[PDB]
């Protein structure tokens, strides 16, 4: 059953952040991807058995992190990548604000 926009908006209003996160992830999409700390792109070749985690073009096997994002967001970022747009997923703070 679809938990649309109106459904999301209502849950925001309530303030129930964990339920809204659970319904959008655990109850649906939810995908684990390894991203390059250097770039921010899903260009990491994640070998779980051999541990050859290195991202081709970056040479690093160290600055790599796993992330929990909706599979549709993964597909969104890849669709943007396929359109010469870079949605560099950065795990580090750099502007304070």
């Amino acid at each position: 059953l679809r938990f649309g926009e109106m459904e999301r908006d209502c849950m925001i209003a309530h303030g129930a952040a964990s339920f809204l996160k659970e319904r959008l992830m655990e109850a649906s999409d939810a995908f684990r991807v390894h991203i390059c700390g250097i770039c921010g792109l899903m260009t990491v070749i994640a070998k779980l058995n051999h541990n050859q985690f290195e991202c081709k073009g970056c040479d690093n096997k160290i600055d790599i992190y796993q992330i929990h994002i909706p599979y549709a967001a993964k597909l969104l970022f890849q669709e943007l990548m396929a359109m010469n747009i870079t949605p560099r997923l950065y795990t580090d703070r750099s502007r304070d604000f």
Binding site: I38, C39, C58, I62, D63, D92, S94
Partner: protein, 178 residues
């Protein structure tokens, strides 16, 4: 997954810097003037083979004191065997690297007794040289000024040939007995 201490800034790919060499072109982490857990700008802590030996021994002796606190509620060859026992108490047998390190450190230590090493560090960490050069001079036994300048090429013009010999001759007197 222990990558920390001196982190940032990484702005896309980067050149990688330069190859790690004895021209004091040390790792992008081992800067002459680094940071601290408190926050202050602390100078690089480089230990010689004599310092490092009495540093791990100190930490491990003080480790067993604290490890047995929770349980409630000095001769050449004899140093080898005593440390071997301590390593089995304080740490698990899995840490084979520390066992290889301690065995090496105690057999290659230029200064055994704490008292002498204190004076070695007061003599070296005053010369106005890079901490790595100090850690190398106190580790490697040198008779000639040229011997030191060849083994530690970071020196050359950094120190006077005659003045370096004064230090090298002083170390020979400071030398412990095995």
């Amino acid at each position: 997954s222990t990558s920390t201490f001196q982190t940032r800034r990484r702005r896309l790919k980067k050149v990688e810097e330069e190859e790690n060499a004895a021209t004091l072109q040390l790792g992008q982490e081992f800067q002459l003037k680094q940071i601290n857990h408190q926050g202050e700008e602390e100078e690089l802590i480089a230990l010689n083979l004599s310092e490092a030996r009495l540093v791990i021994k100190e930490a491990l002796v003080e480790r067993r004191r604290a490890f047995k606190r929770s349980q409630k509620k000095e001769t050449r060859e004899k140093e080898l065997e005593s440390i071997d026992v301590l390593l089995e108490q304080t740490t698990g047998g899995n840490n084979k690297d520390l066992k290889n390190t301690m065995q090496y450190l105690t057999n290659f230590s230029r200064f055994r007794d704490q008292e002498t090493v204190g004076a070695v560090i007061q003599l070296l960490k005053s010369t106005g040289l890079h901490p790595f050069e100090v850690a190398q001079l106190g580790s490697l036994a040198c008779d000639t000024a040229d011997e030191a300048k060849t083994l530690i090429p970071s020196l050359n013009n950094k120190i006077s040939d005659d003045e370096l010999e004064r230090i090298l001759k002083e170390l020979s007197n400071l030398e412990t007995l095995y």
